[PDB]
Design a protein around this motif. Structure first.
Motif, mmCIF file in Angstrom:
data_model
loop_
_atom_site.group_PDB
_atom_site.id
_atom_site.type_symbol
_atom_site.label_atom_id
_atom_site.label_comp_id
_atom_site.label_asym_id
_atom_site.label_seq_id
_atom_site.Cartn_x
_atom_site.Cartn_y
_atom_site.Cartn_z
ATOM 1 N N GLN A 1 18.833 38.290 -11.691
ATOM 2 C CA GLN A 1 18.282 39.214 -10.710
ATOM 3 C C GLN A 1 18.514 40.638 -11.181
ATOM 4 O OE1 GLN A 1 17.516 39.250 -6.190
ATOM 5 N NE2 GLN A 1 19.760 39.306 -6.493
ATOM 6 N N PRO B 1 19.108 44.640 -11.575
ATOM 7 C CA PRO B 1 19.691 45.613 -10.640
ATOM 8 C C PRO B 1 18.585 46.340 -9.882
ATOM 9 C CG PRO B 1 19.787 46.439 -12.895
ATOM 10 C CD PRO B 1 19.361 45.002 -12.987
ATOM 11 N N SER B 2 18.833 46.634 -8.610
ATOM 12 C CA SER B 2 17.865 47.389 -7.809
ATOM 13 C C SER B 2 18.630 48.342 -6.899
ATOM 14 C CB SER B 2 16.960 46.464 -7.004
ATOM 15 O OG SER B 2 17.667 45.799 -5.978
ATOM 16 N N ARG B 3 18.749 49.602 -7.335
ATOM 17 C CA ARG B 3 19.258 50.695 -6.506
ATOM 18 C C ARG B 3 20.754 50.579 -6.235
ATOM 19 N NH1 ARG B 3 14.858 53.544 -3.776
ATOM 20 N NH2 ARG B 3 14.057 54.464 -5.724
ATOM 21 N N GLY B 4 21.571 50.649 -7.282
ATOM 22 C CA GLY B 4 23.020 50.551 -7.146
ATOM 23 C C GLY B 4 23.578 49.141 -7.128
ATOM 24 N N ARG B 5 22.887 48.215 -6.459
ATOM 25 C CA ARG B 5 23.232 46.803 -6.570
ATOM 26 C C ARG B 5 23.067 46.357 -8.016
ATOM 27 N NH1 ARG B 5 21.240 47.888 -2.303
ATOM 28 N NH2 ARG B 5 19.171 47.870 -3.305
ATOM 29 N N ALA B 6 24.150 45.845 -8.597
ATOM 30 C CA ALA B 6 24.130 45.424 -9.986
ATOM 31 C C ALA B 6 23.365 44.106 -10.138
ATOM 32 C CB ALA B 6 25.559 45.280 -10.512
ATOM 33 N N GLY B 7 22.869 43.871 -11.343
ATOM 34 C CA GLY B 7 22.218 42.613 -11.630
ATOM 35 C C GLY B 7 23.217 41.497 -11.884
ATOM 36 N N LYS B 8 22.800 40.267 -11.573
ATOM 37 C CA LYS B 8 23.639 39.092 -11.776
ATOM 38 C C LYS B 8 22.776 37.904 -12.182
ATOM 39 C CE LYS B 8 23.524 38.235 -6.760
ATOM 40 N NZ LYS B 8 24.321 38.210 -5.485
ATOM 41 N N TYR C 1 18.430 33.935 -2.576
ATOM 42 C CA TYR C 1 18.227 35.183 -3.305
ATOM 43 C C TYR C 1 16.959 35.856 -2.801
ATOM 44 C CZ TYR C 1 21.762 33.346 -6.510
ATOM 45 O OH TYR C 1 22.928 32.857 -7.059
ATOM 46 N N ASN D 1 14.170 41.587 -2.124
ATOM 47 C CA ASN D 1 14.628 42.961 -1.835
ATOM 48 C C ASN D 1 13.487 43.961 -1.589
ATOM 49 O OD1 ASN D 1 16.827 44.608 -1.215
ATOM 50 N ND2 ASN D 1 17.087 45.348 -3.327
ATOM 51 N N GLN E 1 30.943 48.003 -15.875
ATOM 52 C CA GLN E 1 30.505 49.364 -16.146
ATOM 53 C C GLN E 1 30.235 49.508 -17.639
ATOM 54 O OE1 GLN E 1 33.753 51.858 -14.678
ATOM 55 N NE2 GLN E 1 34.499 50.119 -13.467
#
Length: 346
Positions: free
Chosen positions: A56, A58-65, A76, A79, A98
């Motif tokens: 998934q 990343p979309s707007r601060g939410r990290a990808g996983k 899932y 968004n 990071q």
């Protein structure tokens, strides 16, 4: 082989191909079902394809996983919605919290010489040196170029592997990363009958049901390999699924009976294996006992209520198979067994 009625159109981007594909994927089906559909649409265009996973972005601060394959895809939500949900199919590299490492410094960690040094540390059980390279940012999801092993699958073959397995997992190793030949660390621990390593992998959350490149599970490998049956029991007790077949329709009890692995057979029966299951030639596990002269396996099947009148697709019963193979003692065992002489599980 087609998607269910509730399937929805998803765009999947594949950065390593620089392309995207639109697929119907099933929210009510498991994420691993969606991955099989992606693989089918890519039609063998990826190298090392079994080490790619749905991701998934990343979309707007939410990290990808990476998506949890065992979970349900509707777990899932897409968004900030575009007409189509967008997922990506990415190689199973370490997911960094990071970005703290220069591109030049990151490259230095991953030269051929330094990845060999890291594998040598694993081989030599130098747990603290492994941990220190991981803290510097080394990604342990890679293959040794000569052996094809990854750090985790090699660690899984060492005595007292637990400390090293935990450090690799904490340092970003995926538990389902596969070797060059397609085995996970769960397969490798099982094949070596390394019960300490297997227990730790399952306790860390590894699934017992991982498939290799031929669709075979660790439990299937354990029935081929025999020996100490503890690992087979560990898998079954952790709810491993039974009834996996190879290309010829042989299940786990067919294999156990070919090689006379009578303790594996008994565990498989206790956990519910179907004694009447027929492979592509129509043979039951009893037919396999008769063919390979595996008398104690035959006694277990008969004692638990296996039907001895089943004919294979050559019209042969297990008795007739025994007679043709010259296995006359085993034939007499089958012929004289009384149908009342049984203690079935269910």
């Amino acid at each position: 082989d087609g998607p269910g009625a509730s399937a929805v159109v998803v765009r999947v981007g594949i950065p390593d191909l620089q392309q995207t594909k639109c697929l119907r994927l099933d929210p009510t089906a498991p994420v691993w079902a969606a991955k099989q559909r992606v693989l089918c649409a890519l039609n063998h265009s990826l190298q090392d394809a079994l080490n790619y996973g749905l991701f998934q972005p990343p979309s707007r601060g939410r990290a990808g996983k990476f998506l949890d394959e065992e979970r349900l895809l509707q777990d899932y939500p897409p968004n900030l919605d575009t007409p189509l949900p967008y997922l990506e199919f990415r190689y199973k590299r370490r997911v960094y919290a990071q970005n703290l490492i220069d591109d030049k410094q990151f490259a230095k960690l991953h030269t051929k010489a330094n990845l060999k040094k890291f594998m040598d540390y694993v081989q030599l059980h130098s747990t603290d040196k492994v941990a220190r390279l991981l803290d510097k940012g080394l990604d342990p999801n890679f293959h040794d170029p000569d052996s094809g092993e990854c750090p985790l699958s090699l660690a899984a073959q060492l005595d007292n592997a637990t400390d090293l397995l935990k450090v690799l997992r904490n340092g970003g190793a995926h538990l389902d990363f596969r070797t060059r030949d397609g085995l996970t660390a769960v397969h490798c621990a099982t094949r070596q009958r390394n019960a300490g390593a297997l227990t730790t992998l399952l306790d860390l959350g590894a699934s017992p049901d991982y498939k290799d490149s031929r669709g075979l599970t660790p439990l299937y490998h354990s029935a081929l390999g025999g020996g100490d049956a503890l690992c087979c029991e560990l898998l079954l007790h952790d709810h491993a699924q039974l009834g996996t077949t190879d290309e010829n329709g042989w299940q786990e009890i067919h294999q156990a009976c070919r090689f006379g692995h009578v303790q594996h057979l008994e565990h498989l029966l206790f956990y519910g294996a179907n004694m009447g299951a027929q492979n592509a030639s129509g043979n039951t596990a009893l037919h396999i006992c008769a063919l390979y002269n595996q008398e104690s396996c035959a006694r277990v099947l008969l004692f638990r209520g296996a039907n001895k009148d089943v004919r294979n697709y050559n019209s042969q019963t297990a008795f007739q198979v025994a007679i043709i193979a010259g296995n006359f003692e085993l034939a007499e065992v089958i012929k004289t067994h009384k149908d009342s002489d049984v203690v079935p599980f269910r």
